């Protein structure tokens, strides 16, 4: 039996348990978003604002239930309303990551009917990050 390492094994929600997504797999997800008429959008954050925290709760009474800091990230430009071209999305991913090379960047998509994010996955992790493991080192 292999042991799942509890050290430097941070995840990033949807698809983080699969091997790193290839450009092709990412493009496929983008085609999925556009084909379904959803609204693509990019969000980013510096390292200290990447994972949920409880900092603000110091100002709270007994109302911390389901409150966490760092869930909100910074929006890159605006949601791509009316986008029907996967290429425009790939272009923005390049622009965003180029502008913030040391920040975490994630691609999301919105459904305005249910009014909720219907997809999301990390597309960039800073190079200096040492809190995660490659697919083959998640268990020892």
């Amino acid at each position: 039996m292999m042991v799942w390492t509890p050290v430097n094994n941070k995840m990033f929600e949807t698809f983080s348990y699969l091997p790193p997504l290839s450009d092709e797999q990412i493009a496929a997800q983008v085609d999925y978003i556009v084909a379904n008429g959803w609204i693509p959008c990019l969000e980013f954050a510096e390292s200290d604002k990447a994972y949920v925290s409880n900092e603000s709760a110091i100002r709270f009474g007994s109302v911390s239930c389901l409150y966490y800091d760092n869930r909100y990230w910074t929006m890159w430009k605006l949601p791509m309303f009316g986008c029907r071209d996967p290429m425009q999305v790939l272009r923005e991913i390049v622009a965003c990551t180029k502008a913030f090379p040391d920040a975490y960047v994630r691609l999301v998509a919105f459904d305005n009917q249910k009014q909720v994010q219907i997809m999301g996955f990390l597309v960039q992790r800073p190079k200096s990050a040492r809190d995660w493991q490659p697919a083959n080192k998640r268990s020892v």
Partner: protein, 467 residues
Amino acid sequence: AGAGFKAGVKDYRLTYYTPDYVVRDTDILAAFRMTPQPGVPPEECGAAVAAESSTGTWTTVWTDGLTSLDRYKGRCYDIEPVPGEDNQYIAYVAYPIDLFEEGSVTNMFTSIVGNVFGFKALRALRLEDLRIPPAYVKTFVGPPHGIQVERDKLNKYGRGLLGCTIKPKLGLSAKNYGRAVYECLRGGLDFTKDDENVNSQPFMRWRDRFLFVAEAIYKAQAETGEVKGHYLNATAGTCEEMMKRAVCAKELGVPIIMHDYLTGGFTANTSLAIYCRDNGLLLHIHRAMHAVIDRQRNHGIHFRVLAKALRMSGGDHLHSGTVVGKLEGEREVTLGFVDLMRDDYVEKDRSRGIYFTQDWCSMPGVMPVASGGIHVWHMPALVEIFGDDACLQFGGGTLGHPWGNAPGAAANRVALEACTQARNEGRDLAREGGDVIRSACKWSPELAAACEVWKEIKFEFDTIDKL
């Protein structure tokens, strides 16, 4: 003179069978699968059901004259034959909105299924569906949060959620419970939960459990970087005990608690749902005891009605069956009531057991929870059946993994994401399910180990609850 009081018995049909009645958009409608005793006309039996579930009794009472029966009486306005049965009928009854107490599922059930199921004049009766009009739906607070809000609070999007019931059901100490919870959550599961019958017992008192579970939740969350939760059971013998447990969860800052709405009861459940809304707690609803009522085709209440009732009383999650697991759940029927608990508007569709078009008038949708005897090989079918808006739970499917809880969780999380990825890429899970899982096994030792253990396990039996 005019209509007067005449003591004595007369057929119910004379007052309660109105085949030409035009239902009003505010009427609550019921569809009853009725089996009359021999010698009892279907219209009289349907009339009796309508009468004794609304305003009438067995003999003429003079007091009817003080009010207006035309305005308050329940009406059997339609009797439909049942294909393949020559003594079973679907009787439709219309109930004026005035007959119900606002926001009380308890009251709605007391009238519609209070006494009629025990009448000597009928051999069997089953409530198949209820049309809850928007005007009545609006009298309910409803679910504490609902699917969209829940996802927004957990910051989880793009895939089904993953849960797991700790095992053994009973017998574990509070610390061991927290031990199993931490190991489960740290491996990739979003939630873990108290078994429905885990409340407070000699081997583990509730407050001890809540505390150790909190440590486990926070340790797993810090380790993974993903929001974690464990449904702490608030189900208790009294409302005072129920609230004490909900209050403790609030004080610990944990995200979610659970309640067995049928064994605890609608009155208690509604109070708890209201508390959760005012305090920001997610509420997972377990349907313990539902099969005692909804298993047989000839008698009882179909789960779809029990689901509508829960959505009204309030619940963020509600078990929906798995179709492919150890517990029964016919596919078409299940797809039907899943829409009824999640969607805003559901068109009548008898092929899925939907007897009435249901308008929820913006009441929040309830997250369906597929749980019970499922493992990694079932993932393709589960994702295909439920889609992303559901929570798939693997109890034995996690704590039964040969390498432990963390690896077991990893296997399920991997299987879920692999299938989710596949679907989005355009692959047909119904046909390529096996290949998707086998491909993930190549780079996931945890999944491979899980696949080898349960490869030959399937649950396929004759379905009792058939349309």
